[PDB]
């Protein structure tokens, strides 16, 4: 789901 991509990105720049 395209609408879930930004959530995933958020967790990325938040982890490392």
């Amino acid at each position, epitope marked *: *789901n*395209w*609408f*879930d*991509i*930004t*959530n995933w*990105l*958020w967790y990325i*720049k938040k982890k490392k």
Partner: antibody
Framework: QVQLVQSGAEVKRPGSSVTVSCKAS????????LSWVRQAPGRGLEWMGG????????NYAPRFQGRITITADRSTSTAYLELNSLRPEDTAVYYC????????????????????WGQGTLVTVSS | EIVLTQSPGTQSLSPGERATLSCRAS???????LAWYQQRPGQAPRLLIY???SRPSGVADRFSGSGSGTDFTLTISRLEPEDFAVYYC?????????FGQGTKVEVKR
């Protein structure tokens, strides 16, 4: 505070192409999803598609796939909607909308739903 | 494509009364990604509920969302004068997002 400001109303001839802009200020621009929703006079809201600037990844509703182009300029935090081969049925108010976020500030976790809306741009297709 | 049905399309109610608006999906909405918006004449839509039941800060708590799967409901505990407007549901459980046709809550007299 996240604010979206759209370009002014426009009259376009049948068969032409229209470009509407949406400038964002406040919060992050590259990692949040921006969509375009239109509403014909007296009708309901219709999601047309969206874009995620950072990945330049677009998502278009099948109904507009082939007639629409959504782009984002990270240098000016501006998103654009281009709709081609205009017909009278395309006369409507076009809104840009950005997903909201959780907690305080505006750099929190994205919620998908459209929390922020532009003022709308009336596009009139006529001769 | 998930078709969202909002029936009835209009509800005539009195100020102070409770209101429950239905949104039925043609198929299960992934992860309950269902939102509700309010729209008054000449104004842009305003987000009221997201994720079926979450209410963003600033939205009056007399508005609540419930349901899951293909059966969702927006409840307005007590109608204030400014609550008479149009309400749209939207699903974003899959890449192709869709809106219901909207329900107009008007004043009965």
């Amino acid at each position: 505070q996240v604010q979206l400001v759209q370009s002014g109303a426009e009259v376009k001839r049948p068969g032409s192409s229209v470009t509407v802009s949406c400038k964002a200020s406040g919060g992050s621009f590259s990692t949040y999803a921006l969509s375009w929703v239109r509403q014909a006079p007296g009708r309901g809201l219709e999601w047309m598609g969206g874009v995620i600037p950072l990945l330049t990844i677009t998502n278009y509703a099948p109904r507009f796939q082939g007639r629409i182009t959504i782009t984002a300029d990270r240098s000016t935090s501006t998103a654009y909607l281009e709709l081609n081969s205009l017909r009278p049925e395309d006369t409507a108010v076009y809104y840009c909308a950005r997903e909201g976020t959780t907690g305080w500030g505006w750099l929190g976790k994205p919620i998908g739903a459209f929390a922020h809306w532009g003022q709308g741009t009336l596009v009139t297709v006529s001769s | 494509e998930i078709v969202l049905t909002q029936s009835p399309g209009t509800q005539s109610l009195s100020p102070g009364e409770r209101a429950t608006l239905s949104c039925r999906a043609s198929q299960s909405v992934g992860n309950n990604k269902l939102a509700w918006y309010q729209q008054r004449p000449g104004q842009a839509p305003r987000l009221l509920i997201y994720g079926a039941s979450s209410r963003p800060s600033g939205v009056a708590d007399r508005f609540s969302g419930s349901g899951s799967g293909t059966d969702f409901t927006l409840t307005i505990s007590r109608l204030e004068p400014e609550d008479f407007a149009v309400y749209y549901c939207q699903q974003y459980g899959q890449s192709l997002s869709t809106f219901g046709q909207g329900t107009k809550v008007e004043v009965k007299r």
